[PDB]
Amino acid sequence: ETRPNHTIYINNLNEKIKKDELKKSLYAIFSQFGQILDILVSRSLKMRGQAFVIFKEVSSATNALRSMQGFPFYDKPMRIQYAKTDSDIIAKMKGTFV
Amino acid sequence: PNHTIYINNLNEKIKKDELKKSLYAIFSQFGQILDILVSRSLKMRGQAFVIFKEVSSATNALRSMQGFPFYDKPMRIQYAKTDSDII
Amino acid sequence: TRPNHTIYINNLNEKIKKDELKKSLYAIFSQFGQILDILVSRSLKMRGQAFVIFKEVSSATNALRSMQGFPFYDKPMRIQYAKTDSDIIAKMKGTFV
């Protein structure tokens, strides 16, 4: 599987939720674990419903993976992983996450 | 017990719109919510009301999200003194 | 190789009694789902091992992601997926109780 990283990869998110309400509600949940740099969210409505929360230090992401795993967020328990290396940066320039 | 839970110790620095939408993001798992009243008034601020359809939902919600760090601040959930507008 | 409901843990602190261990493992892996059994090796040659059997594969996969290399009794444990029936074969043989 994937080594630790300061950014966590979230999937199984409710696609029906607008990007603005989502990115801001994700910050509402993960602001406890540390300083969030950016939060990238899947662009299209059809998209599986994914997001990236980029922390300043890996400690926050490591805690986030353990504590918020499977948390029912918008009636859907979100499935947290560690982000593959630089996938957060690659996903932004490719412009699939905003 | 009561059908609506009283939440306080909320981060006042967050706008009313972001708050109601983030609260619904958290408590939608426990049942059907009718309304969520939020106000930045001087007495009513830092607090919120979550109106559930059935009391069983509120008991699990109060049980589950007590002390939940919501915007770096663990929230204080209670039961409402009186009932809600709904009968 | 492929996913399984059971995770294979090794590099466990051998100085800890098996009784305290099984209970402390349940304290850590009960979060990822419903656990069926927790098998710990009693053997002399194969020392420092365990099996955590979850009801659903989702549980085992999440445990692998979250607790990989976690220092458990000041010793970071090394998690894998169980090799198929390897869990029951070690139980139908008494190397794990």
Add this chain to the structure above:
Amino acid sequence: ETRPNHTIYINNLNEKIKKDELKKSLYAIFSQFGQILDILVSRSLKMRGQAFVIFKEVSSATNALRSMQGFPFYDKPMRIQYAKTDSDIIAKMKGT
């Protein structure tokens, strides 16, 4: 609590767990951050679902708060703080 201390104050602990199984599971988790002096646990009504982990050096406690904050321990995420005031065993080192 903002002020660091040798002792971390843990709450939101699974109250149904026996005192012996608890301290042994807490030691199983916090022995990584340094040397633990004692782990005080009480199942009484006032101290129920709480714990104290007293470290030798504050660096141990700070690393512990940093790493295990919000960690789901017995299907319950624990909320770690710093202790209000030095533990009694600590205050016998620093003469208080």
Add this chain to the structure above:
RNA sequence: GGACCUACUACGAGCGCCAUUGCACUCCGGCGCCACGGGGGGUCC
């Protein structure tokens, strides 16, 4: 001190239910169920 019985007893354990989110280091919340321990009473070595 042991082993086997009991129209006895819930003091501990151990089960559940309710309440408690509480900063300690001078035990100690509340019920209910259950004699596994103990405690009585009894047949023996």
Add this chain to the structure above:
RNA sequence: GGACCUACUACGAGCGCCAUUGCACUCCGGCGCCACGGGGGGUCC
């Protein structure tokens, strides 16, 4: 209808400081900073 302004206005918004832990279901604590939008008054094509 456009553009280039204002010795005007903080009506919306958006920033910080202070005070605030408060039980409601019509409703707005207090200064400061800022004309992004607006609103006036203008000079032109």
